[PDB]
């Protein structure tokens, strides 16, 4: 039918910048709407009828377009504007897939720490090695695991937090799960973070046969 | 004033059914068109159903295929959505919304009610203390953790010293390993205060109605 697409899918900017995001329609439609969502809460009416601001919306926001192309614009962006914005219109089944606006800030290297499997998880036949990478920027970051001098990439799961409310950093966990036997069969465990704050990685390790 | 409060969500097996409700306050419920909109785990938003002020005109979304039924009771200010023959792709957060004028923007939304459709069964979590051990740290700060593994369904809530430790906490989004969710939480405190002053993580799983405390203590080697 008439369907919507949005662009860009993700973008980041420093506060003080102009911001524009686009919503387009496979054929001509009118009276476009725009909804704001932040993690953990419901979508919220922001702009409606192509150009009308909902109540409580700063005058830095403006909406425009006609036919098959519409946009939402922000002057002098503020940190509170960070959110995902979705377009939708009265003849459309599926909402546009959203532009996520994120906050740009100064680069920062992660604080890294590594944790051997706990004694009580071992008693149950399992072994998770946990590595935290906290308070870095930008979000792009690489983690490498080495066991006994060899690189390993099988039982690893990585999870990022949403951009932090207070300082706009990101944190991530990287978890390597094994059984007890495979853990008992190797000695040196290393967690390595390669960011772009560092040509040289940040390294944290332990030996199983210690403690 | 205006309030939209939803209810009836929960966990159901494929093929099953469930009826959602949305209680209203603060306005003349009979004057307004109402809708249900759903957000998939992929954050995708879909117009599931629509109903006019009187209940005489109705619309359903494309993938609905006869299995949804929207109704209202303007005498009890309540909106309903009956779901039949559920599929896994019907898993979503479901929102009750109100319409403003005849271009059909949605000016008020409810808090949402979560519908999960799978064969998995409710499982309490395991909670393991993450102390440094053979990877001891040696600076002004120390980072500790708790590992939460093997629970279904979401969510869990993690606190530290019953909420007293709030700064320096990162609790990461859960990840699905084999129909069971796993999550970790870290906290950073001054190096001088541990184990001198106790650190405990508090894990709550509402669905299994379980509460467990794990003190983070140094190991025996």
* Tokens read off for B87: 């599929």
Q: What is the CATH number of domain B3-117?
A: 2.60.40.10
3-state helix, strand, coil in chain A (%, to 5): 5, 50, 45
Name A120's Cβ contacts closer than 8 Å, sequence gap at least 6: B128, B129
Token representation of residue A156:
């690893």
Q: A128 contacts in B (CB within 8 Å)? A: 128, 147, 149
From chain A, pick out residues whose CB is under 8 angstroms from the CB of B44. Answer: 94-95, 97
d(CA B89, CA B67): 13
Tokens of A9: 């899918």
Size of interface A-B (CB pairs under 8 A): 133
Where does CATH 2.60.40.10 sit in chain B? 3-117, 126-216
Element (H, E) at A104: none
* Domain regions of chain A by residue span: 4-103, 111-207
Q: Does domain A4-103 have CATH number 3.40.630.10?
A: no
Q: How far is CA B77 from CA B3, B23, B32, B47, in A?
A: 11, 6, 11, 21
A35/A55 Cα distance (integer angstroms): 13
Query: Best of B39, B134, B143 to disrupt the A interface by mutation (most A CBs within 10 Å)?
Result: B134
Structural element, H or E, at residue B51:
strand B45-51
**At how many Å resolution was this determined?**
2.0
Strand spans (E) along chain A = 4-7, 10-13, 19-25, 33-37, 44-48, 52-53, 61-66, 69-74, 83-88, 99-103, 111-115, 126-136, 142-147, 150-152, 156-160, 170-179, 188-194, 202-207
Report the candidate in A103, A60, A58 with the shortest Cα–Cα distance to residue A83.
A103
For A111-207, CATH number out of 3.50.50.60, 2.60.40.10, 3.90.25.10, 3.20.20.70 equals: 2.60.40.10
Rg (CA), chain B: 23
Tokens of B127: 């909670």
Cβ-in-10-Å burial (0-12, 13-18, 19+) of B196 comes to: exposed
C-beta atoms surrounding B105 within 10 Å:
23
With contacts defined as CB-CB under 8 Å, which chain A residues touch B174?
159
Please state which of the four CATH numbers 2.60.40.10, 3.20.20.140, 3.10.20.600, 3.30.70.360 is assigned to the domain occupying B126-216: 2.60.40.10
**Which DSSP category does A122 fall into?**
H
CA dist., res. A113 & res. A143, Å (int): 12
Is residue B151 within 8 Å of B208, Cβ to Cβ?
yes
Q: How far apart are CA B110 and CA B101, in angstroms?
A: 18
């Amino acid at each position: 039918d008439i369907e919507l697409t949005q662009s860009p899918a993700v973008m980041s900017a420093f506060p003080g910048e102009e911001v524009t995001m686009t919503c387009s329609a496979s054929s001509s439609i009118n009276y476009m709407h725009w909804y704001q969502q932040k993690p953990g809460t419901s979508p919220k009416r922001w702009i409606y009828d192509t150009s009308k601001l909902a109540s409580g919306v700063p005058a830095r926001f403006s909406g425009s377009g006609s036919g098959t192309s519409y946009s939402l614009t922000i002057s002098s962006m503020e940190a509170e504007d960070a959110a995902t914005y979705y377009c939708h219109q009265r003849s459309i089944f599926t909402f546009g897939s959203g532009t996520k606006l994120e906050i740009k800030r100064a680069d920062a290297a992660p604080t890294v720490s590594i944790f051997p499997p706990s004694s009580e998880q071992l008693t149950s036949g399992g072994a998770s090695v946990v590595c935290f990478l906290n308070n870095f920027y930008p979000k792009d970051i690489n983690v490498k695991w080495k066991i006994d001098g060899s690189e390993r990439q099988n039982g690893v799961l990585n999870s990022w937090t949403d951009q932090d409310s207070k300082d706009s950093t990101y944190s991530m966990s990287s978890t390597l799960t094994l059984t007890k036997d495979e853990y008992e069969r190797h000695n040196s465990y290393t967690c390595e973070a390669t960011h772009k704050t560092s040509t040289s990685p940040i390294v944290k390790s332990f030996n199983r046969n210690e403690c | 004033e205006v309030q939209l409060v939803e209810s009836g969500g929960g966990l159901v097996k494929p093929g099953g059914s469930l009826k959602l409700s949305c209680a209203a306050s603060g306005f003349a419920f009979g004057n307004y068109d109402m809708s249900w909109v759903r957000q998939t785990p992929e954050k995708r938003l879909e117009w599931v159903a629509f109903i006019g002020s009187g209940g005489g005109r109705i619309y359903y979304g494309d993938t609905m295929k006869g299995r949804f039924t929207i109704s209202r009771d303007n005498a009890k200010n309540t909106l309903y959505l009956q779901m039949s023959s559920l599929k896994s792709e019907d898993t979503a957060m479901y929102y009750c919304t109100r319409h403003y004028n005849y271009y059909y923007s949605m000016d008020y939304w409810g808090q949402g009610t979560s519908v999960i459709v799978s064969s998995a069964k409710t499982t309490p979590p395991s909670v393991y203390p993450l102390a440094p051990g053979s990877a001891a740290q040696t600076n002004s700060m120390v980072t500790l953790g708790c590992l939460v593994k093997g629970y279904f369904p979401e969510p869990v809530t993690v606190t530290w010293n019953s909420g007293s430790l709030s700064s320096g906490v990162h609790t990461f989004p859960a990840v699905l390993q084999s129909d069971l969710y796993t999550l970790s939480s870290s906290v950073t405190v001054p190096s001088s205060t541990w184990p001198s002053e106790t650190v405990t993580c508090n894990v709550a799983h509402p669905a299994s109605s379980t509460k467990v405390d794990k003190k983070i203590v140094p190991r025996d080697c």
